[PDB]
Amino acid sequence: TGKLVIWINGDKGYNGLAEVGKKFEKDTGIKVTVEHPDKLEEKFPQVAATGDGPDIIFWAHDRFGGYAQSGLLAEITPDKAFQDKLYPFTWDAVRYNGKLIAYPIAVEALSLIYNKDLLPNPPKTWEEIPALDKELKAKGKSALMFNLQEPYFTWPLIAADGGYAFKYENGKYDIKDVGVDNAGAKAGLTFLVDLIKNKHMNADTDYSIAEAAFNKGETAMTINGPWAWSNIDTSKVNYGVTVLPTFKGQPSKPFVGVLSAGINAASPNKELAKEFLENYLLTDEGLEAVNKDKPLGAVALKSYEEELAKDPRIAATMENAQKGEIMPNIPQMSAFWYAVRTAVINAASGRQTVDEALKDAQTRITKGSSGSSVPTNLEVVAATPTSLLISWDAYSSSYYVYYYRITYGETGGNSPVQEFTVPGSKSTATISGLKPGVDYTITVYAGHYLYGLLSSPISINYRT
Ligand SMILES: [Mn+2]
Ligand SMILES: [Mn+2]
Ligand SMILES: [Mn+2]
Ligand SMILES: [Mn+2]
Q1: Domains in the chain and their CATH numbers?
Q2: Contact between residue 263 and residue 257 where contact means Cβ atoms under 8 Å apart
Q3: Which one of 16, 27, 357, 408 is CB 3.0 to 4.6 Å from 347, fit for a cystine?
Q4: A single GO BP annotation from the record?
Q5: Rounded to the nearest whole angstrom, what is the distance from the C-alpha of residue 39 to the centroid of ligand 2?
């Protein structure tokens, strides 16, 4: 409680961040320790409460969803004046169930990268690309090569004309609303597949081949993110970075990643963590200190971004991000990647129509129950030596839940798990006939009147 421990990845400007921490110590006498363990994103949930977990954790926003579901992150409380300092869209990356759970720091998205010596005026639309490729092939070059294997790289086009992963509305994901097979995703993927069948691109092109071709001066354009610029710099190609082309007049929709800073829910230093983040780090001066150490790319703080965007590669990054799709931070996004990978390979190879390929992907992604269930926090409400009463937020369940299955057994010790059921009108259960002295793992499942037992139970450890 005398201090602030910060975790940040070892490839980030943690020495710049330590300088900000030293200025904070100079103004407050609070010592700020910046650590950069490997695998920090796996370690955090294991050490958070309490021992030596950090007060503040910096990571891509997409992991913070899982942390928040687990109750590991404090709800943050920036005032209106602070909220206005960051681009509004970046705040949508750090909500979980409508509550703010982190501060946006930096923003990444794919851009169009072009060889100025081959193409001083890069295309404004995807539609111009076939004609440009024809004119370049007659000169032994291609217009465009980019990684086609990963949906992260093909999504910007697929989704441009109205596709989306999960609908985001009223500050939350509507997980039942997926936009993988709508008419927009179909137009996008049809255009992509047509480029490939017409030999404007090769269906086998992957990250390495695209990067090699561009850096060797063989292709006029590629699609890649800020992490690739220093590699291009070693090639001496005269390159530019610009807004992705439009499709059907609509912007490409790259996924947006936001490096974010979360405050540990178990931290006794939450107000100091807040002061540090809002009043020291998230200033022109604080972000510059980090950036000087290792560049952040585009940043969420408007004043400092205005300075950084004098580098048009950063201005392009931010513009592609403002037009893009925030990467969903919900667990159901896990199914997206392999589903869309399959769709794209099958459509591109001509194994399936675009329509059937995306319909199969949409099916595989929506695979998951209609309704909400229990997330719970602090379950055990009463105890005797041999008996305990548990409690869960049954009110969180949809009306489809008609029962709860309670399981309890020996913690660690691989023993017979006991189980019983209660009606869905019930929000508590007494467990009894237990040994006064051992660790128990109590777990509760929701039962749906159609699907039966649902997959995301609530589980706690207790001791009598
Ligand atoms: Mn470093
Ligand atoms: Mn045609
Ligand atoms: Mn160079
Ligand atoms: Mn400034």
Answers
A1: 1-109+256-328 (3.40.190.10), 110-255+329-370 (3.40.190.10), 371-464 (2.60.40.10)
A2: no
A3: 357
A4: carbohydrate transport
A5: 48
